[PDB]
Scaffold this active site. Sequence first.
Site, PDB file in Angstrom:
ATOM      1  N   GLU A  35       4.623   7.015   3.411  1.00  0.00           N
ATOM      2  CA  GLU A  35       3.471   6.371   2.786  1.00  0.00           C
ATOM      3  C   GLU A  35       2.442   7.387   2.289  1.00  0.00           C
ATOM      4  O   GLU A  35       1.897   7.222   1.192  1.00  0.00           O
ATOM      5  CB  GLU A  35       2.799   5.398   3.753  1.00  0.00           C
ATOM      6  CG  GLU A  35       3.620   4.177   4.105  1.00  0.00           C
ATOM      7  CD  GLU A  35       3.859   3.219   2.955  1.00  0.00           C
ATOM      8  OE1 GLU A  35       3.389   3.442   1.811  1.00  0.00           O
ATOM      9  OE2 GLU A  35       4.552   2.211   3.219  1.00  0.00           O
ATOM     10  N   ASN A  46      -2.181  -0.234  -7.022  1.00  0.00           N
ATOM     11  CA  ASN A  46      -1.041  -1.109  -7.255  1.00  0.00           C
ATOM     12  C   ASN A  46      -1.150  -1.794  -8.601  1.00  0.00           C
ATOM     13  O   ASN A  46      -2.240  -1.931  -9.154  1.00  0.00           O
ATOM     14  CB  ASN A  46      -0.927  -2.158  -6.149  1.00  0.00           C
ATOM     15  CG  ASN A  46      -0.808  -1.535  -4.773  1.00  0.00           C
ATOM     16  OD1 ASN A  46      -1.559  -1.872  -3.855  1.00  0.00           O
ATOM     17  ND2 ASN A  46       0.127  -0.605  -4.628  1.00  0.00           N
ATOM     18  N   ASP A  48      -1.045  -4.808  -9.311  1.00  0.00           N
ATOM     19  CA  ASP A  48      -1.823  -6.046  -9.256  1.00  0.00           C
ATOM     20  C   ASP A  48      -3.324  -5.777  -9.160  1.00  0.00           C
ATOM     21  O   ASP A  48      -4.122  -6.708  -9.117  1.00  0.00           O
ATOM     22  CB  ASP A  48      -1.359  -6.928  -8.081  1.00  0.00           C
ATOM     23  CG  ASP A  48      -1.802  -6.401  -6.717  1.00  0.00           C
ATOM     24  OD1 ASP A  48      -2.194  -5.225  -6.607  1.00  0.00           O
ATOM     25  OD2 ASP A  48      -1.744  -7.170  -5.733  1.00  0.00           O
ATOM     26  N   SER A  50      -4.861  -4.165  -6.674  1.00  0.00           N
ATOM     27  CA  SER A  50      -5.209  -3.764  -5.314  1.00  0.00           C
ATOM     28  C   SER A  50      -4.962  -2.264  -5.142  1.00  0.00           C
ATOM     29  O   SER A  50      -4.374  -1.614  -6.010  1.00  0.00           O
ATOM     30  CB  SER A  50      -4.409  -4.559  -4.278  1.00  0.00           C
ATOM     31  OG  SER A  50      -3.030  -4.247  -4.361  1.00  0.00           O
ATOM     32  N   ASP A  52      -3.920   0.834  -2.029  1.00  0.00           N
ATOM     33  CA  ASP A  52      -3.432   1.180  -0.700  1.00  0.00           C
ATOM     34  C   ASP A  52      -4.212   2.383  -0.178  1.00  0.00           C
ATOM     35  O   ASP A  52      -4.419   3.351  -0.921  1.00  0.00           O
ATOM     36  CB  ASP A  52      -1.947   1.548  -0.717  1.00  0.00           C
ATOM     37  CG  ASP A  52      -1.029   0.388  -1.050  1.00  0.00           C
ATOM     38  OD1 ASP A  52      -1.438  -0.780  -1.002  1.00  0.00           O
ATOM     39  OD2 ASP A  52       0.163   0.651  -1.295  1.00  0.00           O
ATOM     40  N   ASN A  59      -3.135  -2.134   2.335  1.00  0.00           N
ATOM     41  CA  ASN A  59      -3.467  -2.704   1.043  1.00  0.00           C
ATOM     42  C   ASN A  59      -4.723  -3.585   1.054  1.00  0.00           C
ATOM     43  O   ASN A  59      -4.914  -4.388   1.970  1.00  0.00           O
ATOM     44  CB  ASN A  59      -2.254  -3.494   0.553  1.00  0.00           C
ATOM     45  CG  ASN A  59      -2.378  -3.916  -0.879  1.00  0.00           C
ATOM     46  OD1 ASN A  59      -2.824  -5.017  -1.161  1.00  0.00           O
ATOM     47  ND2 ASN A  59      -1.997  -3.039  -1.796  1.00  0.00           N
ATOM     48  N   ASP A 101       2.087  -9.818  11.704  1.00  0.00           N
ATOM     49  CA  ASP A 101       1.893 -10.908  10.745  1.00  0.00           C
ATOM     50  C   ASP A 101       3.133 -11.779  10.519  1.00  0.00           C
ATOM     51  O   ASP A 101       3.036 -12.839   9.909  1.00  0.00           O
ATOM     52  CB  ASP A 101       1.418 -10.334   9.404  1.00  0.00           C
ATOM     53  CG  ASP A 101       0.949 -11.402   8.436  1.00  0.00           C
ATOM     54  OD1 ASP A 101       0.042 -12.178   8.794  1.00  0.00           O
ATOM     55  OD2 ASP A 101       1.505 -11.467   7.318  1.00  0.00           O
TER      56      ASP A 101
END
EC number: 3.2.1.17
Length: 129
Positions: A35, A46, A48, A50, A52, A59, A101
């Site tokens: 990562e 990202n 979209d 967003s 990280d 995110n 999650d």
Amino acid sequence: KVFGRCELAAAMKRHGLDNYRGYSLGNWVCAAKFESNFNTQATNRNTDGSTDYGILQINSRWWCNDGRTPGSRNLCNIPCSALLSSDITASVNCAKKIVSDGNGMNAWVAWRNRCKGTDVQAWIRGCRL
Ligand SMILES: [Cl-]
Ligand SMILES: [Cl-]
Ligand SMILES: [Cl-]
Ligand SMILES: [Cl-]
Ligand SMILES: [Cl-]
Ligand SMILES: [Cl-]
Ligand SMILES: [Cl-]
């Protein structure tokens, strides 16, 4: 801060990440390697919109607030900047929520693609833990 491999393993263990939700320490170190290359200041934008953040590239769509991700949540209740600190506490605490999650460490696509199923113990081999 750019952590050494064993340095990060020790810090993750200190903060209770070792075998958290059944994921051994090497899984977490492997995820951090791919990562962020162990760099707490890593950021990536990202498609979209967003972003990280940090050693585990957490995110802003769900987990932290950066004020520039429309429609997003802040489920770890932190500014995304907290995830860039030399102190990994905020990243670890948020990672614990993420991995709980429902999909385990598959939440980290890089973990699924590069760590899952591999000899992840190699990432903590030799480390004084
Ligand atoms: Cl640095
Ligand atoms: Cl390494
Ligand atoms: Cl391991
Ligand atoms: Cl936002
Ligand atoms: Cl929220
Ligand atoms: Cl730390
Ligand atoms: Cl799981």
